[PDB]
Symmetry: D2
């Protein structure tokens, strides 16, 4: 066929669906996925259009991290016209995609100096280097916030033109825009990709049906690699994607108020972070925890809920303490095993992947969609995304030594972010006794590959059988590529 | 036949519905209320069959409190045959009403000595006085629990034959038993009770309909007095009932385990308390917060959720920290303004009330149902419930001095239960500076009536307009009865 | 006679002794006081030459506070030449008076935003207004410090030419310089000043002797008003001075290191503050608590010791935790009842006072000495000391409303500086319930006079008999002056 | 006879020798400063049943030590009578309390505090000692933080306390009355040849001749005897168990009628208040084994002691005046048991390594050594504790490794810390490996007790290497 099947109904599937439908009016594009959006990252997102706010010293210390940052800055420029084009297919009563134009980054001491102080400096540096509009402002001038004095910020940074969207209104606008462009929504899941003679034939659905296609775009979030890995040789040629389980909440504020801007800290222990995204109608979004899990999980832990609420009520606004909990949200950030996204073509003709975007696939969605659509039309898409081709040896963006320093520092940061109260000698003792066991795990996993810190901590506290399976995986990948 | 309308589909409405339908073949009985059970206490309950566990030194210091306790002990004896009679109308696949036969009461130091130490002694005394089977056990012998050592119990009390039911399975069994007995469920709300010539005519429903009846039983939980107060003179003759908003949660335990018994503390600050009720299928119930509100609220505050989770994870089982949150539940304990229930007949022929049961209407339900059904058949029901007739001057069960000591002590207990960490001189200072403002409020509200501590704290932190309205209410009640 | 007696052997007595001896070589100057220096402020001082570091928003909001600040800035200019003139009478082996040239002010969140944030801004403003050399610096550039990350500074201010002296080496240098200039040390205490026909005759000593003099300078620290108040009418014409009991400690650092600068916060709750003053030979000085006491006290409380050690180990250097405690020091800051010093002449010819200097008598010593010596020579001394003449109606430097806001804010600051951990609603409740009792005390004490916050808190927690005695004192002062 | 050392043990044996051998000259060495002195820093509790731990009573050597403590308690009333008899009313009273209350709170590890409270109750019942578990509400005087309050309390009848300062004064006075001579210098060297003591070189250069030398020099005792031939690897090393205590003038001049204490806690730390005359209370006491002596409190020790006392015993102590921070060295034997009795050198005796309870055992230990010196057999239970011995192995390496991880965790729970709930289990798992590795590296046969193992873990690599050599030289000497 010249038929296109998009597998997945998150921001990436729907965004690529809209761009394919709009630019290929002569082709049938069908998008698979259910309204439940099981383990769905996009519906649990605030979401911040995070570029400069997402800067960490650790990310900007690697070439791959600097490349990722450049793409985030490029994506930000597409959002105004993208939103215009999505709202155009609706009416006033569909509501507004954009919920804030600006972001304030707060620096408080409820965290590790080695992360929060380094990350605040790295954000300031990245803004100056980009000539991006921003101002360090007096904390007293930040409107709305009412923190616990012992948890209060002492520095604040206003980032102009870095805002937020309502992820629910965005998903609704994308579905409507997809239909307007001639797309068809088929609310079932793909169970199997069918291929022979090095080319896609189509997709078996979970209602037993077979849908034929010349093109299949896998944008199934954390399920994307598990779906393609069934095809011959692809188990050790497409980097694994795990579930970065994240917890967020919708809160009806005590007085119906909200901040005019996004409020956030820099990224914290293991890509956790504290932020408040404005919503319409006396609701605010607060987020968001992160924990890499080797198996999917669709419910918040008690610990995640308490940590998120404690951070927001102390560090942002004590008024949230008396505010009503409307919804606890859980979704899976697609967490690539080598720390970088899986975007583009495959050794199978007509098979494409758009996944592994972790914290910022929603922000990058208009750029990533346009890239894959350019590739499908025989173009070269966006310069700088070829490094992130899905069929690849695992990337080694950092030394084993760098990752081992990072994992101990992030482990300690879970304490300082609580925040704990310990005898003053205990942290130094814990630091010294964490180094050995993480060095031992890293050496045991593989002679060539080291999992990034966020994955290494999950592997450290997984079962021995799960660690053994990963040792086998890394060995089979080394065999395939070397 | 002579029609009966039961207004309300909680435990009390359904329990009286079942008893009327089963004992009165001459009556058509119709029960009003919606499946949503808005503000419903019963669905948010664990629930503990609380008699001896509910004992406090303060309750047993008043004649009215001792009378209430006696009824709780009598109700416990009805439960085995009551459950038998409800399960008999179903099949194995409907599930079991009883989830535990026994209770363990734990004493830890995450609370005020003036409440927890006095209440533990009062429970021991009440058990010995009743010749009830119990024993003080070694904490090491309490199975399953895994508390934070700094939050651990140092004393434990096993109460034999004081257990728990699944409130959801009880409600299902009551509805099924009601239908089997010839009852009719009409899923609408009463908006108005119609009366003329000193007699009930029936009920206007919220779909505009009028249902005629010779008998109307109001068991609408926290809405019960607001519904009858519209009838002539009844605004100052039926004590007000407020919303004792309570938060509980269902948790899927990390390993599917649960305790074999109820685990609880004694009642704590303002009729808050910590307990875990076993459930079938790897779930546990944890509860339960309490806050008297002058207006209803159907969502948990952030503060209530954090406090409940923090108490359960530290004081009962650290494993709950990594367990999955299934559901946050919110319901309104009917909180009578004078601290005692509203049970029996009215100055309006055929108008009955079953409400204001606060923490233990579910436990007392089989006894309370049988009492009201006996009264409706011209009997005298249960000895000792006449004091709790719904049409009455406000009861004064305590001196103003007693309530003022209680409210300061319970306020301080909110600190010790957190638990806070303060400079050692601060608690004595706070105690001294709380006395004056509560004495001033009590003196300003009325020359004769004092709200019980749980209501006094809610009034202290209500708006000036709400305090003024209550001053007018107490003055109009004094006028009516004196 | 033309003989001069200086009563008191602290920094002020010895400083004025040195200036009199050096400028009047034809006159006999005798200095009284014993080597033990009971309750002595000077030996317990670090000491910081505190001018800009002592700035608070509250002080600079009053005309009297702006006058005090101007004098501190004038005194700072005298110190380099004053030290040169004192070291000139000794040799290298006598040790160096100056222990640091510069001060770093740190801003952390272990305190009340309403004090620490306002005071940091006030220091920056006062430095710019004075054209003083200073720089806001990166916290990472502050050498030596190793705080708890949860207690770490996020802003830092370098003040050039605001340093510290070794108070012990200063006292030794002053005694040596006094003897070199012809001064005589008589190690007894004055019991009585003798005066008749409106002129001083001399001093009765505690060994029964009488020393004649034409001039008596009272610099007896917290005992100075008690000594002059015995003269006719002077009991209600010389403002009372109380004991500002302060605790400091000498610590031998784990590795013999110390910072190159003074390290301090701004002044905190009730003129407490955290600072570390470098010393020679592997010692550091840490201070300093403050409590106004209605009677003198010569030993640290447990609370004062714990608070000082906890602040220093968390906020400055965790290495101090493992460091050896050499000495806990206690001295009495002369605390004037109206909040301002007693400097200059009297209605008695030849009677002078130099006292009530509270936190900065040592810093102001060279200026205060020169002022009194100018007055004794028939000059007008230093411009801006006239409001601080010792024979005066009590100053009212603030409105009762200003002091009431200050005392509640400083009370709350004792919590945030601990730092406490409380439920988020508790601080607002405590703030509301503190206002009434302090307003009631202020209204009861006097219709015209209000004690400054530091004294008001001591009176609030004193016995009813001590409050009654103060009501009588204020009434007798009003009678004398109105 | 020369007694080397002027602590409770030296003076107690001095008094017993002087009183029972009136025909002999007994001279006692030591200076008024009592540098690193344990006795002056002691409360002191006459600790027998209060000193019981589950871990101590699980070993034969620990049960033997406990039996001696119970025997010593019976000697105290007549011993005090005999010391006060040499003075007047104005010298003050040695005894400050007759009874002890043991409090159980949750400011500690369940694995220590809960096990130790049960072990105390059991040891009291087994001994037929008078005691009763009492309502916490019936404990007079105490005013704890409610979050730090006890929920169980135990009254121990006839287990009390003495004023260590008044005891030392009474011992010196009683020594002089009995014909003893005080020579305020330190021994630098014991002189011996032909397998017999000749006497002592003092630090002022003098030589004092003697037929008997009793070494009771606290934590310095083994270092002094180790200089004699072969004795470096035949007398177990003694280290400094540095302890911090404080004298506090109470806000209202009040005090409790009894000793107030918890059971022993992390690494033989413990919280107690000992009554004193004149509106003073003693609070103690920290413990840290140090490989070199230390004569000043750390900031951490002072804060921990004050924080424990103000929260767990009486909030009134917060506003009370600090009179004195005291520091002394508990003689900490490397194998965990005392060094009492005779030597392979004729006329050389040792009384040391008593750690937490040398003062309590002093009248029994004095009488034992005096019996031995007179050709008797002294007290039946003391033979295992002879000073010239292979290092005792009272516990398995596995037992000590469980203990050291549990005591490390207890330092957290006693603070008390506030941590994420997953952190303690993680720390427990990551402590096991490094302590197992240290124990295996130190020796194939000897394991230091937990209190010493933690000090070795955090010592310099050179100090660990020196201990590996010491253990190897001891193994060589005895096997
Ligand atoms: C708590 C949280 C907060 C976040 N905050 C932000 C933020 O502030 N800014 C930001 O830019 N991003 C944010 N993100 C999202 C992040 O950018 C993600 O990388 C992004 O949403 C990924 O989108 P996706 O379309 O790849 O995956 P998803 O959004 O997970 O979409 C995948 C969809 O495919 C479906 N699917 C799965 N298997 C199949 C199958 N076999 N067949 C068909 N359908 C299938 C799933 O059910 C799901 O609906 C957040 C995410 C989380 C969890
Ligand atoms: C968190 C929590 C924990 C609890 N734990 C326990 C426990 O362990 N043990 C125990 O014994 N009890 C427990 N209780 C419950 C307590 O006993 C209550 O007193 C009891 O459930 C009250 O029963 P009810 O039927 O009067 O009220 P509800 O259960 O509130 O029932 C009233 C019903 O009437 C409906 N209604 C309201 N207005 C109208 C109208 N106009 N027309 C028709 N229907 C209307 C409501 O929607 C509701 O469904 C708990 C309650 C809470 C909130």
């Amino acid at each position: 066929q010249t038929d296109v099947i998009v597998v997945g109904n998150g921001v990436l599937g729907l965004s690529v669906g809209v761009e394919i439908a709009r630019t290929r009016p002569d082709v049938r594009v069908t998008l698979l996925g259910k309204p439940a959006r099981q383990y769905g990252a996009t519906p649990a997102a605030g979401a911040m259009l995070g570029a400069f706010g997402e800067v960490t010293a650790h990310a900007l210390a690697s070439e791959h991290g600097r490349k990722k940052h450049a793409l985030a800055v490029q994506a930000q420029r597409l959002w105004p016209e993208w939103i215009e084009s999505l709202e155009a297919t609706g009416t006033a009563a569909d509501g507004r995609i954009k919920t804030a134009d600006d972001t304030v980054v707060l620096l408080n001491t409820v965290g590790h100096s080695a992360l929060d102080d380094a990350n605040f400096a790295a954000v300031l540096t990245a803004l100056k280097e980009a000539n991006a509009p921003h101002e360090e402002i007096a904390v007293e001038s930040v409107d709305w916030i009412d923190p616990d004095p012992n948890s209060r910020p002492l520095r604040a940074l206003h980032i102009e033109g870095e805002g937020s969207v309502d992820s629910g209104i965005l998903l609704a606008a994308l579905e409507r825009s997809f239909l307007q462009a001639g797309g068809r929504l088929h609310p079932v899941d793909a169970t199997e990709i069918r291929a022979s003679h090095g080319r896609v034939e189509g997709v078996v659905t979970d209602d037993g049906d077979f849908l034929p296609a010349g093109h299949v775009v896998v944008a199934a979030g954390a399920r994307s690699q598990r779906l393609v890995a069934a095809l011959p040789g692809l188990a050790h040629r497409i980097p694994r994607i795990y579930d970065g389980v994240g917890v967020s909440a919708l809160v009806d504020t005590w007085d119906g108020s909200g901040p005019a801007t996004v409020l956030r800290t820099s990224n914290r222990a293991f890509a956790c972070g504290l932020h408040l995204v404005p919503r319409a109608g006396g609701s605010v979004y607060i987020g968001a925890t992160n924990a890499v899990c080797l198996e999917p999980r669709g419910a918040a832990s008690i610990e995640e809920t308490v940590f998120l609420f404690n951070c927001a009520t102390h560090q942002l606004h004590r008024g949230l303490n008396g505010s009503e909990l409307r919804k606890v949200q859980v979704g899976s950030r697609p967490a690539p095993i080598d720390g970088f996204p899986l975007i583009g073509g495959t050794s199978v003709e007509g098979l494409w992947m758009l996944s592994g975007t972790y914290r910022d696939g929603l922000h990058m969605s208009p750029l990533l969609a346009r890239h894959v659509v350019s590739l499908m039309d025989g173009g070269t898409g966006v310069d700088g995304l070829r490094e992130f081709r899905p069929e690849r040896d695992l990337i080694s963006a950092w030394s084993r030594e760098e990752i081992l320093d990072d994992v101990v520092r992030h482990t300690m940061a879970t304490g300082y972010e609580f925040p704990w109260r310990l005898p003053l000698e205990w942290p130094h003792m814990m630091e010294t006794f964490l180094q050995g066991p993480f060095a031992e795990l890293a050496d045991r996993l593989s002679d060539t590959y080291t999992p990034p810190a966020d994955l290494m901590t999950a592997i450290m506290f997984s079962e021995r059988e799960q660690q053994d399976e990963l040792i086998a995986y890394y060995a089979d990948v080394h065999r395939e590529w070397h």
